[PDB]
Amino acid sequence: RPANHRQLTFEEIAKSAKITVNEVELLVMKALSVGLVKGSIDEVDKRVHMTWVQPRVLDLQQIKGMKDRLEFWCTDVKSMEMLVEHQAHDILT
Amino acid sequence: MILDKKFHGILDQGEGVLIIFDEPPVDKTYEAALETIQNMSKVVDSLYNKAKKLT
Amino acid sequence: NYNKAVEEEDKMTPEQLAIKNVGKQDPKRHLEEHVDVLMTSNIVQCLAAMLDTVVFK
Amino acid sequence: AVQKVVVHPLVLLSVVDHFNRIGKVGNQKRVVGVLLGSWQKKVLDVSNSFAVPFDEDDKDDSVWFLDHDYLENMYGMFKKVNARERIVGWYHTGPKLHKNDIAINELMKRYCPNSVLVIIDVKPKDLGLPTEAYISVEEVHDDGTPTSKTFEHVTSEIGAEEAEEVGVEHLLRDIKDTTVGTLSQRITNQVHGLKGLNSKLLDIRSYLEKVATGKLPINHQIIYQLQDVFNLLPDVSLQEFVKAFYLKTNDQMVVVYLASLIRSVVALHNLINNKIANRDAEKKEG
Amino acid sequence: LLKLFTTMELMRWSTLVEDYGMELRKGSLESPATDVFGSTEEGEKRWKDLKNRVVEHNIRIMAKYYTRITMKRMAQLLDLSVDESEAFLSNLVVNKTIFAKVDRLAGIINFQRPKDPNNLLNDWSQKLNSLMSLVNKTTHLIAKEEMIHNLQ
Amino acid sequence: TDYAKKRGWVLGPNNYYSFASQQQKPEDTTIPSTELAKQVIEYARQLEMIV
Amino acid sequence: VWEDNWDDDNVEDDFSNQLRAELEKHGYKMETS
Amino acid sequence: DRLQFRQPSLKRSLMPYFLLTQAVRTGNLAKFNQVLDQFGEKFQADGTYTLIIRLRHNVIKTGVRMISLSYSRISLADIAQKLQLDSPEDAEFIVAKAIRDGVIEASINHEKGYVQSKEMIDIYSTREPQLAFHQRISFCLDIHNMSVKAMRFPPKSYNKDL
Amino acid sequence: FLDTVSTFTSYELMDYKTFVTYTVYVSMIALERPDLREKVIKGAEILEVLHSLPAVRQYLFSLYECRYSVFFQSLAVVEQEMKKDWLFAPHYRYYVREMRIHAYSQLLESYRSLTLGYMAEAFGVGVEFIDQELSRFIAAGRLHCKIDKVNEIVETNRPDSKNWQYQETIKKGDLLLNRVQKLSRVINM
C-alpha cells in the first residue's frame, strides 16, 4: 500500500508472523538493527509506521501503478502549467 | 519566579500540568508595531497638510 | 530597520515641508529605495504560489 | 574523484565553428574534437580546444579515424604558446551514444589520462543544459556483468571568468542580467513548468516504451531506486505542515503590511504635490 | 564484544550469568577473575555499576531510534522495579536527558516530538527530502537515458 | 410518524440520536493553495498592469 | 480623558444602586461566607 | 451616559430617568418593575406610555443581548436563576436562535437533567488560520490595492495639464 | 516622582509625608512588579520612609508577596482613607477596580487553571462573590479568554501571545483603513 493510510498496527505483523505481542518490539528492533529500514514511529497506541524501503526483486503492480500515478502526476503538472501560464502569459508575458 | 519571567513555565492547581513554551520571533511584532505607530503620524500629518491647504 | 531608519527623518520632513515648500536641498529621493525594498519583499508573494504548486502537485 | 566541472562557452562556439566551416558537403557527422583543460586542480576548467580530422563509415560503426601527429603538433605548439593548459579528453557532437565510443575513448585512455566525455546536440533545440560531463571510469556491477567502460554523469556549469561575460553581453545586447524583482522572477515562474514539462514528458514516453518493449538489460536495478524516489512522497496529508502554512502566511501578512504602509508613505509626495503644484500653477498661471 | 559493539539488542542478562560464572570457573584464560573480585566492595561496584552501565548504555543506543519503545512495558519485560528505573533517570539528569518529554497521567516517555520550529526542522527535512529527490531524480533519469542508447 | 418520514433519522431505545454533527473532514490544503496561487496571479496582474 | 469615563461610569454608575463600596462588608462576610 | 457635557440642566432634567436608565443594564424584572411605577411621573406621563410599555418587555431582550455579549453557554441554575427565568425551553430556544446567527457557537447536553456544555469558545488562533483570515487577506489586499490605484490615478490627474 | 530624593518638607502645598502618602497609590497601583522592583524596591527612598507608618510596609510586602488574607482584612483602611480628600476622593473608584483587576491579572497571570478551593482559601471570600466578579471582569474588564466551569475549576487558555502578538496591529490596520478611505475622500474634493 503506497498511499491511503500507510499507517498500520502490530495485528498484521503478529498475525502474519504468528508471534506474540511481547516479541514485536525485538522484531522491529532487529528490523532497525539490520539497517534496511529507518522507521521511527511516534505512536501512543500500538501502531506500525515504516519508511523508505526497496523491493530489490520485482513489482508488476507497482509498474502499472507507476504508469498510472506517473501519468497522473504528469498531467497534473501540465494542467497547472497550462492553467497558470494560460492567462499569466497573456497578462504578464 | 514565573511572575519574574526568568524562565519559561507555568504552574497548575487543579490538574498540576506543567507546560513550557516560548515565542522566538520577538523582533517582528516590535518593528511592525513601530512602523504602524510611526506611519500613523505620517498619515495624520498628511491630513493636516491637506486639511490646511484646502480649508 | 532601514525603513524605520528613514522614517525617523520622515517624521521631521513635514516640518520643513510645512515651512518652506520652495526648492529641494536633500539629493535623496526617499521613494525609489523604498520601492526597491518592496521589490525585494515581493519575493515572498511570488514564491508563495511556487510553494502552493510544490505542495499541491 | 571529480565532483563538478567548469565548461566555458568558447568550446561550444568552436562547435558552432565546426558547423560553420562545413562547406555544404552533406555529411555533418559526429565531428570529434580534442577537449583541453586543467586537470591539475580537483575542479575541471575548459579554456579552449581544437579539432582533429574524424571520419566514420556508413554501414560499419566500428570505423574510427584519429591522428597522433596532428595531436602532438597542436598540443606541442599550443603548449609552447600556453603551458598552463594540457590535454584532458575529447568530445563529440553526436546526440546518440554509439558503441564505437569505447574504442575512440580507449586511445585517449591508453596514451592520455582519464578522459571526460561530453554529449551535445547538433541542433540548438534542446531546452536543457547541452553539456554533460561523462567520466570514463570502470565500475563493478552487482548482477555479474563483465567490467566495462561506464559513463557516469558529472554535474557541469557554464561560467566565464573575466572577459567572456563582457564579450557575450556586448554581442547579445538583448539578454538581461539577474535583475531581482518582478519580471525576472515571474518569467521563471511561468516558463519553468514547460522547462520541466518538456524534459519529464519527453523522458517518460521512451521510458514507458522501453519498460514493456525493452530488451538487452539496461540495468533494471536503478529503476527500483527510480520508482522508490518517486514513492518517497506518498501524498502527505499536510496535517503537520498546517502550522508552516500559518508561518509562511504570516510572512505574507508582513509583506502586506510593508506594501500598504510603505506605499502609503510614498503617496505623501504625490498626494501633496498634486494639490500644492496644481493650485499654485493655476492661481499663478494668469 | 560484538554484542557491546553496536546495535545492542534487548536481551536477558541471565544468559550472561552462567557466562560470568564459567568465566570465574575456567582457568585456561582470563584466570584472575578472583583477583578482579579480590576486594569485597570494589568487585560489587564493578558488577552493579557494570550491569548499570549496560542497562543505561542500551538506553543511550535506543535513544537514537524514535520507535517509542514504551519503557513502561520494557520494565515489565525486564522484570525489574520502577524505583531503580527512576534512579536510572536520576542518572539521566546528569547524563544530559534535557531532550525528552514526559507525561503526568501515563508513564510513557517521549525522546522526540519537540516544539518543531517550521523554519529549522521541517525546513531542513524538506530540504534534504525535496532536494535529494531533485538531484537524485536528476542522476538516474539522464543516466538511464544514456544507458538505453547502447541498444542502437 | 410524520417526522420519521420527513426528517429520516434513527430511533433508538426511547431516545433521539443525532448523526452528521461536526463530522465534516477539513480540507487537504490543496484547493486553497491553488486559489492562493490564482490570487497571486491577480496580484501580479493588478499590482503590475499599467507598469 | 473622556475615554476612561465610559468604564468608570459603567462600574461606578452600575454600583450606584446597591453594593457601592462593598469593601467594608467583606470583613463581615469572611466569617459568614 | 453624560460624559463630555458639563451643564446644570441635563443633570436635573435626567435625575428621574437616571436610576432607571442605569437600571436597564442589569435588567431586573420584579424589582425595577415596581421601581418604575413607584416614583414614575414624567417619563411615564409623557403620553400613551408606548415606548416605556414596550421597554417593560424590552428589558428581557436587552438582558439576553447582554448575555450575547456575555458568556455564550447557558446553565440551568446559576444564570437561569440569575436572569429570573427558570425554563429550559425558551433558554435552549433563544440560545439556538443565537447559534443559527453564525457569530458564535454553542452546544447542548443532557446527562442527569442539568444542561452541560464544553464552552470551548477558543478563537481561531492555531485552528484553521488560513481559512480563518484568508478572506481577510484577500479583502484587505483588494481595498489596499484599489487604494494603490487611488494613489496612482491622482498623479495622472496632476501631470494631465503639464 | 523619580526625583523625590531632592524633595524636602514644603509647607506651601503638601508636606513630605503627604506627598509620599499621595504617590504611594499611583506608584503602588499604576506600576507592575518589575517597575516596582526597578524603581522603588531598588531605591532606598521607600526603604527609608517605610519606618514612618508601618501600614505602608504591610500594603507593599502584602501586595508584592501576594497575601490577600491580610490585604482584604486591612484594605478597609485604604478604602476609608482613600476618600474624604480634596483632590484624591472623586477618583477613588478607579483605584479600587484597577487594583482588583491588577491583582487578578497578577495572580491569574502565572496560574493557568485554578480550583475554587485554593482560590477561596487564598482570597478568604465566598465563591458566590468571585463568580460574579469574574463574570463581570471577563466581559467588562476583558482580562483573559473564556473561563471554564465544567468541574467548578477556573481554567483559562489565554492565546494572547502567539497569534494575538501579531494581531495587535489589526486595530491600526482597520483604523488606518478608514483613514486611507478618508484619504480617498480627500481626492478631487
Curated annotation (Swiss-Prot), chain D:
It holds the Pfam family JAB. The modification N6-acetyllysine is found at K200, K210. Residues 5-140 form the MPN domain. One of its GO terms (molecular function) is protein homodimerization activity. One of its GO terms (cellular component) is extracellular exosome. The keyword Ion transport does not apply. One of its GO terms (biological process) is proteasome-mediated ubiquitin-dependent protein catabolic process. Keywords: Acetylation, Isopeptide bond, Proteasome, Ubl conjugation. It comes from the Eukaryota. There is a cross-link at K176 (Glycyl lysine isopeptide (Lys-Gly) (interchain with G-Cter in ubiquitin)). Belongs to the peptidase M67A family. Component of the 26S proteasome, a multiprotein complex involved in the ATP-dependent degradation of ubiquitinated proteins. This complex plays a key role in the maintenance of protein homeostasis by removing misfolded or damaged proteins, which could impair cellular functions, and by removing proteins whose functions are no longer required. Therefore, the proteasome participates in numerous cellular processes, including cell cycle progression, apoptosis, or DNA damage repair. Component of the 19S proteasome regulatory particle complex. The 26S proteasome consists of a 20S core particle (CP) and two 19S regulatory subunits (RP). The regulatory particle is made of a lid composed of 9 subunits including PSMD7, a base containing 6 ATPases and few additional components. Within the complex, PSMD7 interacts with subunit PSMD4 through their respective MPN domain. Interacts with TRIM5. Does not bind a metal ion. This is 26S proteasome non-ATPase regulatory subunit 7. The gene is PSMD7.
Curated annotation (Swiss-Prot), chain G:
GO terms for cellular component: cytosol; integrator complex; nucleoplasm; proteasome complex; proteasome regulatory particle, lid subcomplex; protein-containing complex. It is found in: Nucleus. Keywords: Nucleus, Proteasome. The keyword Ligase does not apply. The keyword Nucleus applies. Component of the 19S proteasome regulatory particle complex. The 26S proteasome consists of a 20S core particle (CP) and two 19S regulatory subunits (RP). The regulatory particle is made of a lid composed of 9 subunits including SEM1, a base containing 6 ATPases and few additional components. Belongs to the TREX-2 complex (transcription and export complex 2), composed of at least ENY2, GANP, PCID2, SEM1, and either centrin CETN2 or CETN3. Component of the homologous recombination repair (HR) complex composed of ERCC5/XPG, BRCA2, PALB2, DSS1 and RAD51. Interacts with the C-terminal of BRCA2. Belongs to the DSS1/SEM1 family. This is 26S proteasome complex subunit SEM1. It comes from Homo sapiens (Human). The gene is SEM1. The chain holds residues 38 to 70 of 70 of the full protein.
Swiss-Prot record, chain H:
Residues 1-122 form the PCI domain. Belongs to the proteasome subunit S3 family. The keyword Acyltransferase does not apply. This is 26S proteasome non-ATPase regulatory subunit 3. One of its GO terms (cellular component) is secretory granule lumen. The chain holds residues 344 to 505 of 534 of the full protein. The modification Phosphoserine is found at S75, S87. It comes from Homo sapiens (Human). One of its GO terms (molecular function) is enzyme regulator activity.
Swiss-Prot record, chain I:
Coiled coil: none annotated. This is 26S proteasome non-ATPase regulatory subunit 6. Component of the 26S proteasome, a multiprotein complex involved in the ATP-dependent degradation of ubiquitinated proteins. This complex plays a key role in the maintenance of protein homeostasis by removing misfolded or damaged proteins, which could impair cellular functions, and by removing proteins whose functions are no longer required. Therefore, the proteasome participates in numerous cellular processes, including cell cycle progression, apoptosis, or DNA damage repair. It comes from Homo sapiens (Human). Component of the 19S proteasome regulatory particle complex. The 26S proteasome consists of a 20S core particle (CP) and two 19S regulatory subunits (RP). The regulatory particle is made of a lid composed of 9 subunits including PSMD6, a base containing 6 ATPases and few additional components. Belongs to the proteasome subunit S10 family. Residues 1-161 form the PCI domain.
